[PDB]
Nucleic acid binder design. Structure first.
Lengths: 173, 38, 141, 207
RNA sequence: AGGGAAACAACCCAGACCGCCAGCUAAGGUCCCAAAGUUGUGGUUAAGUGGUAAACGAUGUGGGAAGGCUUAGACAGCUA
RNA sequence: GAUGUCGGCUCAUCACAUCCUGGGGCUGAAGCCGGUCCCAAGGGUAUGGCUGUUCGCCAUUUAAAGUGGUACGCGAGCUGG
RNA sequence: CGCUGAAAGCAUCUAAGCGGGAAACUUGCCUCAAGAUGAGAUCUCACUGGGAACUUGAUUCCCCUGAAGGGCCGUCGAAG
């Protein structure tokens, strides 16, 4: 079955500002998300959305699935805050957020001072945990990746930053 | 990677992807199944 | 005997072309037809009879498929190991007016008439030309 | 912006510690501003700066009227400097006092010129032997190119001819002392030219 | 000899008595250098293939017959 | 009815199938070292003993002492073993 | 090396979208450079006489006038 047939069913008072060319979702708990579609057909029902497609190519059969999952992510974003759990493994490692600055201790010679780009906040409930709250998956996921690539993990000790638990392999020395 | 002329699967976990015009093999298991060109 | 044109009796005109989405080499084949003078009945090969052209948007031009990130423009400097290359996309931000001149220059004779037909071509990367005194007419939008 | 000086000689001063500092002494005439090129007529943004004392028989009436828009009453030479953003108006003596101690500078002169130099002096081009059978050719160049297949000599080769009074800059020297009373800059190092030449002193490019 | 194959004795076309500011054709062609269709119709290829090549490899795609299972719930997926 | 052949000196230029430095999958990669394969031609790339020698074998270095094309580059530029 | 993500309910760095990336590439630093026949740009200086022929961008001659400037010439130069 195809994901382009299932509707959106946007919950709890989410406002659509659709022009036909540039859909604009505005809700509570963060707002101002918008996308532009190249050529699909968007109908606007009583609480759901269906994405009809034009010319039956391989490239309109592929867009209507992509633009359905992108609109669905904007609905959940104003509904729920996207988060990523990053744990720290290793001795002498720590992290502490200072407002909008995330400064780390990774066993280097000089400490790294990572700056968050936009309206996206990193909270640290521990010295070995990061929680990155945002509104869109691609911008939460990009910032979580760039922190991870400071010190990627190791098959011999595991000594390096490591997000949501199931990522790791190992071997003996 | 391991540049060949004939790529193929080795275990049950290998999926063959054609990424940017080249036939790659990525393995969700053991990294020694990673094969580049073919 | 058959009539030939005379260079002191020739009548020439002023055309203006807009290139705002035109394909590069399909645009340029109609400039080079009207610079040589194949659109006039009184065309002899050894004289130059043809219309001045002004091209106004030489940065809106369009090429097809994957050729924007390809199509190197090679030329040699004279010294050993002096071959140089620049693709289509990086060239158009440097000098936009020299994309559309080198395409037309290769569709002309290589004579001392070809150098004289090439002086009737006048391109601009802007939106207005300093030839309001000559009052060019539009053609083929 | 820089100052146009004049090379006068090399000396040596002592730190009271004990080290010696080789020093090139540069005399600065105060430099008048001839004109100020704004960006609106000229495109770029620059000044004209003039050093003095030329006899009033050698100035043409084209020039003499040119140094009368401002009351400069000028001498030899008219140099120009490209500047970022500043305001210089009519005629204003730019003095030595732009500089301080430290202050990495660039110095441009010509050079001493050697007439028609062979490849050994010009290109540091080690020569053939002296005994062991050698004919007339003792310090001639060697061969030029390859055989039949290029057939030509190849542009850019290193033959011989005229070592330069060409324009050469030395870069990133440092100022040891600034003297406003006798109008001197003291520069630690070598300065291109002959004594009595002409020298332009810019603040440094790289720094 | 002449025309064609970019230039190309021996490959295609055709065998020059001379003159013409006359017409129809052959192989090769008809966007611009360069004489003549930016002609009509039905599909196919996105790689600049066309405009160099072998064993061999591959969820590239277009067509044509095959079967295999399936609203009694198949294949995927989340659930023990 | 003549296109002067091997090695040395002088001067070079291009290829990349990389010797060094630069970026990097995998490892039977603990660390220091490595092995192997993709990307990269910007600048570098040893003095001697013995032989007509290129080649080689040695002594001592070095970040490294690269493999080819250019009439097996180069005699109207040198030498003549 | 990725981040979102379909086609192919999952997966997936790619088809659309979005980044990180090396002495190589393009600037960056030093020099020549409008013969760049596409021969550019600024500032300032000079010169305000007639007449005829033949044909009127008018051309040609006759006579007066030679300015801004530059060149010859001389003394030379860490320029040759």
């Amino acid at each position: 079955s195809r994901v382009a047939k299932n509707p959106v069913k946007l919950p709890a008072g989410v406002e659509i500002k659709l022009a036909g060319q540039q859909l604009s979702i505005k809700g509570a708990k963060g707002a101002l998300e918008l996308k532009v579609h190249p050529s699909v057909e968007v109908i606007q029902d009583s609480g759901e959305l269906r994405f009809a497609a034009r010319n039956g190519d391989q490239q309109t059969r592929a867009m209507a699935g992509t633009t359905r999952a992108l609109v669905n992510n904007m609905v959940v974003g104003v509904s729920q805050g996207f988060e990523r759990k990053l744990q720290l493994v290793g001795v002498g490692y720590k992290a502490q957020a200072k407002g909008q600055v995330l400064s780390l201790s990774l066993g280097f010679s000089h400490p790294v001072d990572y700056e968050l780009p936009a309206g996206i906040v990193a909270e640290t409930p521990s010295q070995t945990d990061i929680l990155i709250k945002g509104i869109d998956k691609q911008l939460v996921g990009q910032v979580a990746a760039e922190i991870r690539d400071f010190r990627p993990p190791e098959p011999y000790k595991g000594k390096g930053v490591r997000y949501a638990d199931e990522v790791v392999r190992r071997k003996e020395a | 990677m391991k540049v060949r002329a004939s790529v193929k699967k080795l275990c049950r976990n290998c999926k063959i992807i054609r990424r940017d015009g080249i036939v790659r093999v990525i393995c969700s298991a053991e990294p020694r199944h990673k094969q580049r060109q073919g | 005997k058959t009539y030939t044109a005379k260079p002191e009796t020739v009548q020439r005109d002023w055309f203006v072309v807009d290139a705002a989405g035109q394909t590069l080499g399909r645009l340029a084949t109609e400039i080079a037809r009207r610079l040589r003078g194949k659109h006039k009945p009184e065309y002899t090969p050894h004289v130059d009879t043809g219309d001045y052209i002004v091209v106004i948007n030489a940065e809106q031009v369009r090429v097809t498929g994957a050729k924007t990130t390809d199509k190197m423009y090679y030329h040699h400097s004279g010294f050993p190991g002096g071959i140089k290359s620049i693709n289509f996309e990086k060239l158009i931000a440097k000098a936009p007016e020299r994309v559309i001149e080198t395409a037309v220059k290769g569709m002309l004779p290589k004579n001392p008439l070809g150098r004289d037909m090439y002086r009737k071509l006048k391109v601009y990367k802007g939106a207005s030309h300093p030839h309001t005194a000559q009052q060019p007419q539009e053609l083929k939008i | 912006i820089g100052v146009v000086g004049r090379k006068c000689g090399m000396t040596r001063i002592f730190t009271e510690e004990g080290v010696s500092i080789p020093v090139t002494v540069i005399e600065v005439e105060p430099n008048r501003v001839t004109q100020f090129k704004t960006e609106e007529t000229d495109g770029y943004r620059a000044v004209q700066v003039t050093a003095g004392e030329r006899r009033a028989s050698r100035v043409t009436k084209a020039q003499a009227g040119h140094f009368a828009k401002a009351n400069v009453a000028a001498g030899r030479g008219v140099w120009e400097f490209r500047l970022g953003e500043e305001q210089y108006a009519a005629g204003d003596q730019i003095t030595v006092d732009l500089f301080q101690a430290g202050q990495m500078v660039d110095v441009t002169g010509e050079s001493k010129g050697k007439g028609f130099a062979g490849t050994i002096k010009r290109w540091n081009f080690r020569g053939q032997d002296n005994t062991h059978g050698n004919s007339v050719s003792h310090r001639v160049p060697g061969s030029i190119g390859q055989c039949q297949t290029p057939g030509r000599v190849f542009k850019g080769k290193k033959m011989s001819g005229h070592l330069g009074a060409e324009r050469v800059t030395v870069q990133s020297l440092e100022i040891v002392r600034v003297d406003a009373e006798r109008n001197l800059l003291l520069v630690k190092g070598a300065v291109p030219g002959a004594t009595g030449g002409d020298v332009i002193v810019r603040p440094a490019a790289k720094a």
